[PDB]
Design a protein around this ligand. Structure first.
Ligand SMILES: [Zn+2]
Lengths: 291, 49, 108, 73, 126, 190, 179, 92, 100, 83
């Protein structure tokens, strides 16, 4: 088990390193193909590279599959992209408060296949060992300041990218029961490849959908939208009262979220390579949305 | 002002502002250490006014 | 240009020492001493990072033939108060037989 | 100042979010991940070449599973 | 060329070694004897393998126990596991193989936690 | 009868394998002999900085000036119609003895009877025939070997190859022919 | 056979008793000696499986490159041979064109993969241990030094049950237990 | 474009089998090197090599670069003897 | 072996008054050596001759017999005063200065 | 580990007097002055080496500009004279 997932971490990082080694031969090969097809200008280093022609003729068709969009990108997600139903735990900090366990109640109440554990006293490599053995395909962590929560840490398994994010502007459930259908994800403003990574680690966190009639069937919508790299999520229930009108309602936690870390490797990997963090205390770090 | 208590990245510093009102006026400010070490005023410590 | 620069435009600027109260506390680190403790700490944490990746990514069923001629680091229970995390080494001392100690004490 | 401030969400911002929701619902498009079916997978010269390559892959793939001593997929 | 057996015992964090050799009946836990360790109300749980197995099984051996970590309770369970595994292991290697199986039967018919420690994981319910 | 002789365990067949003698190449073996002779014979070769040099000034060249003549120079002065002793004499203002190596007369004779005038002006019996002994009959390496050894001579050449080759070694004059007269590069006299 | 003279060598230029051109620069037992292959017949067995596998890659790249039998047998060849363990990435058919190799088979053997897992120090020590029978792959005590280990069976390989080597490991680490 | 590939690649596409009237080409349709089960991609290799030679290449993969000089003089001598016989048979 | 060490270290002995051929080989002990003494030049017997209190037993005893031994110790305490710069007595003085 | 027990081979040895004591002291003081000596000498050779490679880097920048100007003027010449 542990030897399996350790060797899968190591083999995955090795194949990613071979992507970074073959980037230049990939762009050179794409200019060779596109300049075979389109027209006569071609660079004489490309035309003179004699290994590129043989390895070209062996490796044309997979770049055709990329341009067509056939094959899937090697990732911590697309091994089990939309077939498995991702079981997602939610936990808190060590001695949670009344407001914090209520907030845990409403965010497990936000995801459909989300189980909730009481914290108790559970050593964190037993969190990753426990979710490692009972295949919780995502856990999320919670942190408070005086019950009013201040962080979440989504982190998924066997070795997937954890995201650490602070937490602002939180309104809980007000005075008064919410459905659990497979929800409607919308994502607005994720323009960059870091936005594409955070959008992938949020859109593989929910149960997938059979693709026939997702456009009409279902009454629950979950909305993520970022202004100034501080994403938003609201939780609304809707009845489509016409063919050209719809009535929404705020159903749950009014939520905004400032991501400050995206670390590849799980919640225990406090030594593994980050891909992103807030660059505060640089001098032009407060003038950029994504990086 | 002078570092009063030194944690790893935070630091309680002293002898600089007179009151929590002044801290709150400067409660997002870019503060700097003459080692060339930037920092941010976060929040007024309560009892050591 | 360097020829188009004066001699007051080449004056060294003076580093300022501490106040006489803080002279108890020590040297004011300005940029040099900060870079010395920063590069030293980066080097230490780089070595500790490599060693944590060793201890995490070690193979429990590993076999070396030096284990038949060395004594391992043990644990806090097999070593007790005399536990550091390290493997002891050889000072070259040895239990010396009784004939040669008779030789050394005729000499003594 | 250091870093970014975090904005206070007001009613115009929240109702503009509601307008984004209503535009996506009515003009229904979503980023829900869709369920893939798991088991997804002259012309005489092309098909003669294809049948010879299928014969080659049955022979070679059997020999590879035999070298791995039936620890294949 | 001595008759020596090393044996461990476990609980939450208390780990205990016990070395059992050819002796004359003593059991000493961290130097002090066995009837002196582990404050009074749990020494019956210390004695449980002795008065299951009978002292006649123990009048030929010496058991030396070092205990580290944990609280008092976990040190008690680590000690009694080290006692039981110590005598089963000594009778495994030095006296005949039938008597091992008889001692395993007595200890297992009482409680298997004298031999196999089962540490608790958690239950993420479905 | 007797307990039989135990077999070994990890026995492999005896195959010839890399890094033998009889498989290894003869030029690699001569490279090993060269590395051993130059490892046993412990010599730190520092050639002496030549006598009569003061920081890239040869004071050892003084009139009567010696001048090694190249095939380039004999061709371009019989082409520029400019007599050799009188115009070297006229560009240095000093009595010269011109020296013509057997590599240089070898290369002019290898050039065919188009250049029989340049050969017949190159074999002037006034001049010092400087007999060389090396296998090549290649004039540019003969000249840089000779100048590198003694560093007295003035080298009369015109090619960018050899002029650029002996701008690298200090304190040597380069005599060229700029179509009406000769030229001297780095002799700090006239 | 003395070192031949000048005239005898140039009368014998092609001559050598040791290397022939048919001997393939003795690449056979460079790989045999390097990876402890106890039989040259097993070298050439792996060689011909390399040859058939690599010409299957050749005739995959001889198809027109939009074809579906190509776009499926590429993924099954690469995924089969990767999860086998011989290749190291599954995103390049040129990697089968020049990166499948009887040295890659031979380094996917058992004493090399447990040397690489540091079950021993060298391939000779690990080979000797797996001919004395201390190892297992999975549940079965493997005593074959040519047992090809696949990529997920490079996790379930350890010492057998009553192993003196394993008592030396727990004995070194000062944590054994005679129970 | 594609017509430059037509007129340029005509001795190879015509060398395969594609003219049943012509004697060299329909001899080459059942010669054996195109009745093997993999031929259109061999000729696709040669024509993509001709395309890169049109796109600014001086050397082909297809040629053997190193030969023992009597094989080589035999082959180049053989090509020159064939073309000399063809030009002495172009006086008909 | 002390004398051989002194012969790889003769540049420090003549303290700047005489510099030598820099001979940095790793193993300073040669394979073949033979410890001799100068006998006599038949032109120099007045000043070019050691006396009874100077025909000492080793080269190291000659260097110890010569002058500049307090110069050796002086340069040695320049070096020790620079190698006790900020090492541990310094930081121990800082800790006492703060805790006082 | 440091040994806190004086063993017998340490309780056995010969206490050596003033002459060999001072030969040891002189030999040590010479060896420390040698170590600081070579530390200085190789510090300054390292600095002069860094100046040498610095200005060699600048002169190879200027050699690169000679390469680009020469090839650019060439392909002006034959680049015009092929057309
Ligand atoms: Zn010559």
């Amino acid at each position: 088990m542990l030897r399996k997932q350790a060797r899968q971490r190591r083999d995955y990082l090795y194949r990613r390193a071979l992507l970074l080694r073959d980037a230049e031969i990939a762009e050179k090969r794409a200019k060779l193909r596109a300049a075979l097809a389109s027209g006569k200008p071609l660079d004489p280093k490309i035309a003179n590279d004699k290994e590129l022609r043989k390895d070209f003729d062996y490796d044309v068709s997979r770049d055709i599959a990329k341009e067509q969009g056939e094959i899937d990108i090697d990732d911590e997600y697309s091994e089990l992209s939309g077939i498995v139903d991702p079981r997602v735990l939610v936990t808190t900090s060590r001695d949670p408060s009344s407001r914090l366990m209520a907030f845990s109640k409403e965010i497990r109440l936000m995801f459909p296949t989300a189980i909730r554990l009481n914290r108790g006293n559970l050593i964190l490599p037993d969190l990753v060992m426990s979710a490692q053995r009972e295949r919780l395909s995502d856990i999320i962590l919670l942190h408070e300041h005086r019950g009013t929560p201040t962080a979440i840490t989504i982190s998924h398994f066997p070795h997937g990218p954890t995201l650490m994010a602070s937490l602002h502007n939180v309104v809980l459930r007000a005075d008064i029961t919410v459905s659990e259908s497979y929800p409607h994800l919308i994502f607005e403003g994720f323009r960059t490849p870091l936005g594409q990574r955070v959008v992938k680690i949020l859109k593989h966190l929910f149960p997938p959908r059979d693709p026939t009639n997702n456009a009409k069937s279902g009454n629950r919508v979950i909305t993520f939208v970022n202004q100034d790299d501080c994403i938003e999520v609201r939780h609304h229930v809707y009845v489509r009262t016409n063919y050209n009108s719809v009535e929404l309602s705020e159903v749950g936690p009014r939520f905004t979220m400032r991501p400050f870390s995206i670390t590849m490797g799980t919640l225990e990997n406090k030594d593994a390579d980050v891909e992103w963090h807030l660059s505060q205390y640089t001098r032009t770090g407060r003038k950029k949305n994504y990086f | 002002g002078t570092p009063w208590k030194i944690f790893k990245n935070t630091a309680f510093i002293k002898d600089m502002f007179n009151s929590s009102l002044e801290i709150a006026k400067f409660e997002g400010a870019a503060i700097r250490t003459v080692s060339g070490i930037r920092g941010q005023i976060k929040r007024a410590l309560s009892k050591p006014e | 240009m360097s020829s188009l620069r004066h001699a007051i435009q080449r004056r060294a600027h003076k580093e300022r020492a501490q106040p006489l109260e803080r002279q108890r506390l020590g040297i004011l680190e300005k940029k040099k001493d900060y870079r010395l403790r920063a590069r030293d700490y980066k080097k230490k944490q780089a070595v500790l990072k490599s060693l944590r990746q060793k201890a995490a990514e070690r193979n429990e069923d590993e076999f070396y033939f030096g284990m038949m001629s060395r004594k391992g680091p043990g644990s806090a229970l097999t070593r007790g108060k005399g536990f550091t995390g390290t493997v002891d080494g050889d000072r070259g001392n040895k239990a010396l037989s009784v004939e040669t100690v008779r030789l050394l004490k005729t000499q003594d | 100042h250091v870093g970014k401030p975090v904005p206070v969400v007001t009613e115009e911002v929240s109702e503009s979010i509601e307008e984004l929701i209503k535009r996506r619902i009515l003009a229904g498009e979503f980023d829900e991940v869709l369920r893939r079916r798991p088991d997804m997978f002259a012309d005489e010269k092309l098909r003669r070449d294809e049948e010879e390559i299928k014969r080659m892959w049955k022979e070679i793939s059997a020999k590879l599973d035999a070298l791995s001593s039936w620890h294949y997929k | 060329s001595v008759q020596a057996v090393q044996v461990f015992g476990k609980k939450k964090n208390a780990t205990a070694v016990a070395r059992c050799v050819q002796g004359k009946g003593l059991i000493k836990v961290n130097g002090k004897p066995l009837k002196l360790f582990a404050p009074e109300i749990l020494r019956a749980k210390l004695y449980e393998p002795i008065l299951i197995l009978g002292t006649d099984k123990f009048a030929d051996v010496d058991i030396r126990i070092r205990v580290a970590g944990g609280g008092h309770t976990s040190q008690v369970y680590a000690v009694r596991q080290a006692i039981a595994k110590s005598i089963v292991a000594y009778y495994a290697k030095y006296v005949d193989e039938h008597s091992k199986n008889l001692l395993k039967q007595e200890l297992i018919q009482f409680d298997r936690s004298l031999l196999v420690a089962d540490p608790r994981r958690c239950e993420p319910k479905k | 009868g007797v307990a039989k002789r135990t077999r070994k365990f990890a026995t492999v067949k005896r195959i010839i394998g890399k890094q033998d003698e009889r498989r290894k190449a003869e030029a690699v073996k001569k490279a090993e002999e060269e590395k051993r002779k130059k490892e046993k014979q412990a010599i730190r070769e520092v050639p002496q900085m030549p006598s009569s040099m003061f920081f890239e000034h040869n004071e050892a060249l003084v009139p009567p000036y010696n001048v090694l003549v190249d095939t380039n120079f004999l061709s371009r002065t019989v082409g520029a119609k400019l007599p050799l002793l009188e115009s070297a004499m006229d560009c240095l203002y000093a009595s010269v003895n011109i020296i013509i190596t057997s590599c240089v007369m070898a290369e002019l004779e290898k050039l065919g009877p188009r250049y029989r005038v340049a050969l017949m002006i190159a074999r002037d019996e006034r001049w010092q025939r400087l007999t060389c002994d090396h296998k090549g009959t290649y004039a540019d390496d003969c000249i840089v070997d000779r100048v590198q050894k003694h560093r007295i001579y003035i080298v009369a050449t015109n090619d960018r190859d050899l002029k650029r080759r002996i701008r690298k070694i200090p304190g040597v004059p380069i005599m060229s022919v700029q179509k009406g007269k000769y030229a001297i590069e780095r002799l700090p006299g006239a | 056979v003395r070192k031949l003279k000048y005239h005898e060598q140039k009368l014998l230029k092609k001559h050598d008793f040791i290397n022939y051109k048919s001997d393939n620069n003795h690449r056979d037992h460079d790989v045999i000696r390097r990876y402890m292959i106890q039989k040259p017949e097993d070298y050439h067995k792996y060689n011909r499986l390399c040859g058939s596998l690599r010409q299957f890659a050749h005739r995959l790249s001889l198809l027109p490159p939009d074809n579906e039998v190509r776009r499926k047998h590429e993924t099954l060849l690469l995924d089969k041979l990767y999860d086998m363990g011989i290749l190291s990435t599954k995103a390049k058919l040129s990697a089968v064109e020049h990166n499948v190799t009887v040295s890659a088979f031979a380094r996917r053997r058992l004493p090399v993969v447990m040397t690489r897992l540091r079950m021993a120090e060298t391939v000779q020590a690990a080979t000797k241990l797996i001919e004395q029978g201390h190892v297992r792959v999975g549940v079965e005590e493997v005593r074959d030094p040519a047992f090809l280990v696949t990529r997920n069976m490079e996790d379930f390989v350890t010492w057998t049950v009553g192993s003196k080597i394993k008592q030396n490991i727990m004995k070194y680490r000062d944590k054994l237990d005679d129970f | 474009l594609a017509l430059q590939r037509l007129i340029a690649e005509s001795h190879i596409l015509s060398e395969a089998g594609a003219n049943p009237s012509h004697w060299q080409s329909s001899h080459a349709a059942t010669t054996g090197t195109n009745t093997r089960a993999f031929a259109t991609g061999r000729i696709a290799k040669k024509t993509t090599d001709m395309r890169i030679q049109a796109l600014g290449a001086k050397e082909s993969i297809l040629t053997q670069q190193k030969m023992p000089m009597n094989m080589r003089k035999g082959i180049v001598k053989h090509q020159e003897e064939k073309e000399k016989k063809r030009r002495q048979e172009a006086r008909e | 072996k002390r004398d051989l060490q002194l012969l790889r270290m003769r540049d420090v002995v003549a303290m700047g008054k005489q510099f030598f051929k820099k001979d940095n080989r790793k193993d300073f002990v040669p394979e073949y050596c033979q410890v001799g003494t100068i006998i006599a030049g038949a032109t120099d017997g007045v000043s070019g001759r050691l006396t009874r209190k100077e025909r000492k037993r080793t080269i190291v005893e000659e260097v110890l017999s010569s002058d500049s031994v307090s110069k050796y110790k002086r340069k040695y305490h320049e070096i020790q005063e620079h190698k006790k710069s900020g090492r541990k007595g310094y930081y121990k003085k800082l800790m006492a200065a703060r805790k006082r | 580990k440091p040994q806190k027990k004086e063993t017998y081979m340490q309780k056995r040895a010969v206490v050596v007097g003033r002459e060999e004591r001072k030969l040891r002291d002189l030999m040590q003081k010479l060896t420390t002055i040698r170590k600081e000596k070579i530390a200085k000498r190789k510090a300054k050779k390292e600095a002069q080496r860094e100046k040498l490679k610095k200005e060699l880097a600048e002169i190879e920048e200027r050699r690169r500009e000679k390469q680009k100007k020469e090839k650019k003027e060439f392909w002006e010449r034959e680049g015009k004279k092929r057309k």
